[model samples]
Target chain A: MDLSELERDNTGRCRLSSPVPAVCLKEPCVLGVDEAGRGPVLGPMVYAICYCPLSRLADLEALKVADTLTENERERLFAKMEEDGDFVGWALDVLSPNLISTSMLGRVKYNLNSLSHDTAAGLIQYALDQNVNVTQVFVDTVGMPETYQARLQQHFPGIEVTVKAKADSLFPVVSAASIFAKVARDKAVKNWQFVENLQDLDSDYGSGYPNDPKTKAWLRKHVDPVFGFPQFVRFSWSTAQAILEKEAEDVIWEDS
Target chain B: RIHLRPGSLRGAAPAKLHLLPCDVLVSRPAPVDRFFTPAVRHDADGLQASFRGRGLRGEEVAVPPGFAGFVMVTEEKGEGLIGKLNFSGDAEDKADEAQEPLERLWGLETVPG
Candidate 1:
């Protein structure tokens, strides 16, 4: 299938397991997939796929050309890049926000690596459904780039996969996909805040990374010591241990 | 023939004799409390210092992947005085900053550098 064929069927929605591929053979189309929010103390893992022809690659790079641009500027650039309606295609999945929150806040911190692999697999399946023959697949480095590539090759035979650290900065399509993934994940996090009635939480909780003391404080407050961690949290992380220690201390002090 | 006390010269030597060949001491007349305390937190007003130094040739230390911040250091000249020196912060911040553009492009809240 060629560019025209892929463009004809590009609806920005499709099941991952369809028999047809998303890209047509005629156009030089590249599939860019990336994962986001992998290290957050909260929120779900998000993966996005963006398909673009060689012609629109420049536009994608232009969006992230500089680091100084504000969020509004970046959004404007994304909007501009999409002006040529037929030039690009994208798909994204936010692996159940509640599941993410529960894992992050509760015990059993979810495995980001496994989540990433699953999301990538889903994206590849989505691409195949559109009948688009992905010439090259680019993924931002996760865990080990080589391992991710090997996994992709194993899962989807006859497809070329290239994984690199900072691929998003070098590949416009990957960057574009990253933008989508990040945006989608951010929305999921915000929605979670609303659902959990945490909209008025302090600004220090910013984004829930380990560095955010506010996020740490909040997690320490909500986690149930008796229950340990919920299914959502990646219990393997040292942060989880810190939470446990804090809880234990709190309990001891209360008894005293 | 420099007969300096061992303990006194131990920690103080590096701050005194280890100056780079091109190191130039820049002392401000007004003592602005140049000592860096762990309690000093990063904030909008930046940092406070008394003495600053420049022209000490050194490697270009890596900053966080996306964000840039200067590292300041102080070297004592002779009398237990501290001079200003700069070193890069941990690269973690750069990596964190690197994601800002991608996040912003997606309409996420802008994180401060």
Candidate 2:
């Protein structure tokens, strides 16, 4: 599958959707939502949705999507789904790191939970806008499961909305969404463009988790004396901020 | 006498800018116009926009009286003056260019979103 459209630009959010599956358009379908890279200190977080006819729900379960699946399995499964385009249709929103950082650092402070909710909701709306005959929606919960489920149900009164603690495992559709979110996120990080003029930069930034030693070392190695880290780093992340405070020059904005 | 450092400002090109209401902790080109500008709505709530699914409330801020706003970029060491490409034919900008070899002067009402 050519990901040129997905990779053409990473500076801002990009929305990509598969051609609505023929079966999905004709029959009542179930859609699932899940996200990847929410905890990473680098790269875009992806919110993905996968939908298929309710009759094919068992087919997705047979694909065996779980958190423990190796990257190889995930990639293989995604490719298989690509071949199954007649039944499986998917969509994703690639939320850039800069957008995430700025949103959280804003004066009003938009938290991650809220961001996740909106992105997932928006992806569902996109499917509806594309005229998918969506009958049920499943989501991997962000905050309180009951409250989240209620909110989604209220917003989508005609559809059955299920927000489960591990819907990714419990619901095959959500599991498929998880795979897409993971694969796209991996590709995004691998292909992240640094708009800064740094020399001989490498992708040894390992795992992108805040606690990862290699990621920490990469952060230390890349801090600019005057401008702080490159845009690739989530500047608003606590780990990134602490490093900036220690290693980079203090900047006081006039309005701040 | 405060003598400014020697650098040619005449060749500087105009660049679009946005004063966002958040700290990004880095300075670099962002897809502001592509992502931020097009989504901006101006109505009863002033300039309204959304970034990464978050609502942004914005207000236009004007430069203070008796003060002017300028966008400046320092020259790289040992770099020669490069000709401006496709200079915007603004009358005020041309006037500033003639007076002090300055590249451009802009009148801006910043939207802080």
Candidate 3:
């Protein structure tokens, strides 16, 4: 399912699915948006948008994306739903770790928030171009809700944009996006190849959060005096900054 | 995209041409989406040559597809002076004839270098 859903473009960005919300045929579509791996310094960030009929809220309520379910359990539930013919039609934007690091470390930086905003906007644009009848969008945001809503509304003009904290739990589809994104992220890291040729590249990098012991261990253990960590590593993370001293102490090379 | 302005004595924006690479990377300048035409004010060096270097992992790197830094000029072209191509200005850069920052076309068809 994930394979057929994924596609790439000339600009180096990719869309994991061309979701045609089934509800678009009868009513203006409703989509719930969320992401995973925002805090992880080791893996890719997955931005996901899940849409269905507003009528499906009752159906989603039955599956239960309970706060109590373990991360793996939630992912399994979502994957199971992925198989149901009548269920979800969704899209994903997978931002690689190298892309994030290079941007943050570039001469003119693109901070995390701006990156997220653009990713979200691009997904909305993607959906609209696919002719989805999108009228309302429910999104999970950690920042000021009014500002976020206004920003999206400015770009979309006619769409209803709702940015709320913990909207994942409040909206089942968002919970699904969150879970799907998480699963994608985990799968990416699990399958991560070290074109970089590290000692134990594939084994474990902990939860990829700076606070995780395994991540901490991996960082300190893999530090290179010259080349540094693999591309999958977020080399611009402040923790990575402390570890590598970044451009100042390293042989930063760009062909220019 | 990126080219070299020869006789480059480093420091204070050394004699060099920087390519706005079209590789869609995540960044602030928004990784040049459209491809560059790469018309140049030539000198001793250009991206229109071969480059294979060790990657971050000491692996061999090759020229990325659909990308050549800039066209190389031979000694016969400009007495070995690599003219820099300017990409920012008034006229439409349809033929890679964008205006320069420091060196203008002067009276020549292109920058004489």
Candidate 4:
């Protein structure tokens, strides 16, 4: 919570650095890291790790990526990033809503800070295992930059980390990571509709922001009242609390 | 009568021409979103206008130069908006070509722009 030491400067340019462990100078790699569904009332935490080689670094950086661009342009860029030989490597993973609901719901309600730490750690580890040799991993700050950096260092030794606010917009790798993570999470949400026997679910449910009405509607309708919410909703969330209270009242009336 | 392409729903069922009387007015191009425009239009009044004032009876009428076709409008459906009196084949073709590239670039199947 103490972000007093965190620097908030308008450094208007993206500064690219080589991957960690200076010994890997011969094998230079930059891993862009980002996460999705951090604020959704439902669904899993998604982390994406994208590895870009120095050879194709310029191609990734050259494009102006922002909300203003059309979907076609974004897809074109994504395809280019994927097909380019010099782009090197990438990996994406999702920590399902069911997993979080079962493990951390009541025990750690509304504890996205911890969930983010754990998820980021897993993604960084995945990248390292793939021989990413992350010279400098760029991360969009979760809480305090220094605190997250400290947590990352404690978990992962001897790797360089740069945690910045709005890292997705500044860093091309991070932006690409965000897009991949977002798209992957959305696809999962859409797939969940079929799995849950709710094929009529709207695409708006995948907005990944708790404020979305459709997401809340889905949670309210599907969450169980007797046993509490199923192992797919973030029970610590206010949305869950509201559902739980309503359901508890219903259960009491039914028992009477 | 709406003469649609062979195998089209309207083409399968042939009906007599029924011209709903109205004051036809032409207007200049109005700015609007490109995607909503249809590729073609086939209606009874459209055929009559194309065939009007020809030497042969109603069967053969001379269509004005550059007259591609016309669209039938209902007062309830049109809601007082002027009907698109002229169809620009060139403009329609350009719009068709422009759509795919925009869709692919934005990673969207359909966009409001």
Best candidate, lDDT = 2
Show model 4 residue runs off by greater than 4 Å: A1-26, A63-76, A106-110, A196-208, A228-232, A249-256, B1-113
Report clash pairs, candidate 2: none
Give per-model CA RMSD: 23.2, 9.5, 11.5, 23.0
Instruction: For candidate 4, write residues A5-112 as lDDT tens digits.
Output: 111101101122223333333476777788777777677677787766655566567754322454456556666556653444556667655445433432224356
Regions more than 4 Å wrong, model 1: A1-26, A61-69, A81-83, A97-110, A196-204, A225-237, A245-256, B1-113
Candidate number with the higher lDDT (3 or 4)? 3
Candidate 2 lDDT, A1-256, residue by residue in tens: 3344333323347888899988787799999999998998888889999999988877788655543868787888899888889899999998877678767765565888788788999999999988889999989975569988878888978888989988998888999999999999987776553322133557678888899999999999987665556556777788988998798655543235
Error of 2 at A239 (Å): 0.9
TM-score of chain A of each: 0.70, 0.90, 0.85, 0.73
Model 3 residue B99 lDDT score: 34
- Candidate 1 lDDT over B1-113, as tens digits, reads 22333343334322211212121223323211222121123333232111011011122233346643322232332232222233422111111233333223465676553
lDDT of 2: 0.71
Best by DockQ: 2
Clashes of each: 47, 0, 11, 18
Cα lDDT of candidate 3 equals 0.59
Docking class of 1: incorrect
Model 2 regions lying over 4 Å from their true place: A1-11, A63-67, A193-199, A254-256, B1-113
Among incorrect, acceptable, medium and high, the docking class of model 3 is incorrect
Best TM-score goes to which candidate? 2
**Candidate 3: segments with Cα more than 4 A from true spot:** A1-13, A18-22, A193-202, A246-249, A252-256, B1-113
